[PDB]
Design a protein around this ligand. Structure first.
Ligand SMILES: CC(C)=CCC/C(C)=C/CC/C(C)=C\COP(=O)(O)OP(=O)(O)O
Ligand SMILES: [Zn+2]
Lengths: 400, 316
């Protein structure tokens, strides 16, 4: 019954027009490998078994939360990301985190925090907004009085304020540049910690809104090509600020939906590019957001059981083509595993298997019923419970 | 200077010019998480960088060290910061530094720090003379590198270097009509020079685009382009664009032509067109042709389209 294994699915293969270019050549090679992957069952005379290697993944994750090989030196300035990706993956798999590791993670994020606010990529590194978002996310996942407490709110707002630009944008860090990605980071920490003052995000929705181009998606900066990672950041940030309507939602829905690979089943980050497991979150994650936005406009034609993407086809991509047998997920077959791709492939899969839009709930889970993951919040990419818990907690505190 | 990759490169703790300063170990906590087992080399450079960072040593040796700490992790923004303060207070030559950043971009064109630093250099020196051609070198290796295009958009806006980009775009568009980064570039140049409101630039643009579709029917980039420059003013504002697409259908078509057709229809019924019922039904049939056959990956999208299309125009 697998949608990607149906013989008809072959008619959904790169329809090159007998004119080759780097783009079609490349696309046809991924298409050929993915095909080998789908045909592996028939060629070997077995009935497909879509099973998510929980145990394997948990191994990788449990371990990495503690020690990494020198192969992660290129992430020496991204330690807090290491935490989020891993803690998030874990919560996604339902694996609990023992209070001592929680306290440990808690204490390291501490060493990562600047006395002037925000978090650095490592102990003693300067504060940047990405590690700031990752660290705050990481803490809200633990969600213990201890975690919450690490975050120094009066300085977090001081720091955010020193990044804010007049045009509505935000610096990724003192002396650095702006991009939609930073607006989201700041909206996110500012939201979860109840630090949003009345002028903090003034001009931000308008600035994010001008990064939407002719494609319908959002560029990293005004004038840039439509990009999934940025699009997610733009729409997400706008949902926090409650200004989604600032965008051309109609052209954005058309653009996301068109980023699904009719063959591979997963999502590319840019039109005319290649599939990539992580875009399972970045792009498919835009569907529940668009949904929430259109719903708030009393849109009556919305579905009440499914996202506006082939949940099935995407789940088959993650399950069949994105798991490394040693544990951990990946971009695509032939690529090495990494915690980033573990985090987002999982994040995406959870999104693809869970629908909810009020009281209307509806799962759809390919392969073995154990493949169900814990739901993920589409704005923050942390567990819905983790969001409610954190905001209730922080709301009980006065905005600096 | 010794290259971090020279056969004879020596650890810092084994250098004479460094004997006076004690390296500073990383403080990961009494017992850490996500702790990286750095190599000896790696640990060596960053232990000594911690030292100069901690004492704010604006020394020449320090500047040299940053380079090694950059190769080891070109993403370490803290080191990039220090390097820049060192570059300024040491009165270091910025053209040499351009030669440096030129080399390391070429080495890792997908790193962000590497590109921001170049931007900082060009602003400082107030000179963009070698930009467009360097970027054109990177794009020669990865015609779609996001940061490269970002950098070339910055250069061109900031120093007004619009005059030759459409030629450039046509150069590349020729190499690969599918490079979506190049279509975006096209839009960028036109938008900021003559704009799309000039009847003559529009006609040209669409025409050119139809020409591209005719040659590569399944290339989604030209289709999005053709939809992008006309969906703003309202697809329906162009009455014979529909008849023309119907004439291309015969032996060309695909899910791109049909969706565009339903896109023209949505705007038609949205703008009090005539024959509303025939057009509505016409559009819903394509909506199902798309869901059920031509573009089923998007079945849910198309189901929604046909749904709202009804809610919006049913006789009621
Ligand atoms: C802050 C945020 C939520 C951003 C999401 C949007 C975005 C720009 C996504 C794409 C990330 C990318 C191109 C590489 C990250 O992978 P990597 O971790 O393998 O390391 P790398 O960046 O060095 O390649
Ligand atoms: Zn990826």
């Amino acid at each position: 019954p697998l949608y990607s294994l149906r013989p008809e699915h072959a008619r959904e293969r790169l329809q090159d027009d007998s004119v080759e270019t780097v783009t079609s050549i490349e696309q046809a090679k991924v298409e050929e490998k993915i095909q080998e992957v789908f045909s592996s069952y028939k060629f070997n005379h077995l009935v497909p078994r879509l099973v998510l290697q929980r145990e394997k993944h948990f191994h990788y994750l449990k371990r990495g939360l503690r020690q990494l090989t020198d192969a992660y030196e290129c992430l020496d300035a991204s330690r807090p990301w290491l935490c989020y990706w891993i803690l998030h993956s874990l919560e996604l798999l339902d694996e609990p985190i023992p209070q001592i590791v929680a306290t440990d993670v808690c204490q390291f994020l501490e060493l990562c925090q600047s006395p002037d606010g925000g978090f650095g990529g490592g102990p003693g590194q300067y504060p940047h907004l990405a590690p700031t978002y990752a660290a705050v996310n990481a803490l809200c996942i633990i969600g213990t009085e201890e975690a919450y407490n690490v975050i120094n709110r009066e300085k977090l707002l001081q720091y955010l304020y020193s990044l804010k630009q007049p045009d509505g944008s935000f610096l990724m860090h003192v002396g650095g540049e702006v991009d939609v990605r930073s607006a989201y980071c700041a909206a996110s920490v500012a939201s979860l910690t109840n630090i949003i003052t009345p002028d903090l995000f003034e001009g931000t929705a308008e600035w994010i809104a001008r990064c939407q181009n002719w494609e319908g998606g959002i560029g990293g900066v005004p004038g840039m090509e439509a990009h999934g990672g940025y699009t997610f950041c733009g729409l997400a940030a706008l949902v926090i600020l409650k200004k989604e309507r600032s965008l051309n939602l109609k052209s954005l829905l058309q653009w996301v939906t068109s980023r699904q690979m009719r063959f591979e089943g997963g999502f590319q980050g840019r039109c005319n590019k290649l599939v990539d497991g992580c875009y399972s979150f970045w792009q498919a994650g835009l569907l529940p957001l668009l949904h929430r936005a259109l719903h708030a406009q009393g849109d009556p034609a919305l579905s009440m059981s499914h996202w506006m993407f082939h949940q099935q086809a995407l789940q088959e991509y993650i399950l069949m083509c994105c798991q490394c047998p040693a544990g951990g997920l990946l971009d695509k077959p032939g690529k090495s595993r990494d915690f980033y791709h573990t985090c987002y492939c999982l994040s995406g899969l959870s999104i693809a298997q869970h629908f909810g839009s009020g009281a209307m709930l509806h799962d759809v889970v390919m392969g073995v019923p154990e493949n169900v993951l814990q739901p993920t919040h589409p704005v923050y990419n942390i567990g819905p419970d983790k969001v409610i818990q954190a905001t209730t907690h922080f709301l009980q505190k006065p905005v600096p | 200077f010794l290259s971090l990759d020279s056969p004879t490169y020596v650890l810092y703790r084994d250098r004479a010019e460094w004997a006076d300063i004690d390296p500073v170990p990383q403080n990961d906590g009494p017992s850490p998480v996500v702790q990286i087992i750095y190599s000896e080399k790696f640990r060596d450079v960053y232990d000594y960088f911690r030292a100069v960072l901690q004492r704010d040593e604006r020394s020449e040796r320090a500047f040299k060290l940053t380079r090694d700490a950059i190769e080891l992790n070109a993403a370490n923004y803290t080191v990039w910061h220090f390097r820049r303060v060192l570059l300024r207070s040491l009165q270091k030559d910025l053209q040499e530094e351009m030669n440096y950043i030129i080399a390391i971009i070429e080495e890792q064109p997908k790193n962000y720090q590497v590109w921001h630093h170049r931007r900082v250099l060009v602003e400082w020196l107030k000179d963009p003379s070698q930009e467009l051609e360097f970027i054109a070198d990177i794009l020669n290796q990865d015609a779609k590198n996001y940061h490269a295009w970002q950098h070339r958009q910055w250069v061109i806006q900031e120093f007004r270097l619009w005059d030759n980009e459409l030629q450039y775009v046509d150069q590349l568009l020729k190499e690969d009509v599918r490079n979506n980064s190049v279509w975006n570039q096209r839009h960028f140049v036109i938008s900021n020079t003559t704009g799309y409101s000039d009847r003559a630039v529009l006609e040209r643009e669409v025409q050119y685009t139809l020409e591209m579709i005719k040659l590569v029917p399944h290339n989604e980039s030209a289709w999005n382009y053709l939809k992008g420059i006309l969906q703003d003013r309202g697809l329906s504002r162009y009455p014979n664009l529909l008849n023309q697409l119907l004439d291309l259908q015969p032996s060309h078509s695909s899910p791109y032509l049909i969706a565009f057709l339903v896109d023209i229809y949505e705007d038609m019924l949205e703008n009090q067109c005539d024959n509303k019922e025939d057009i509505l039904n016409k559009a819903l049939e394509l909506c199902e042709i798309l869901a059920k056959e031509k573009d089923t990956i998007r079945k849910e999208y198309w189901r929604y389209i046909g749904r709202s299309l009804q809610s919006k125009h049913s006789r009621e």
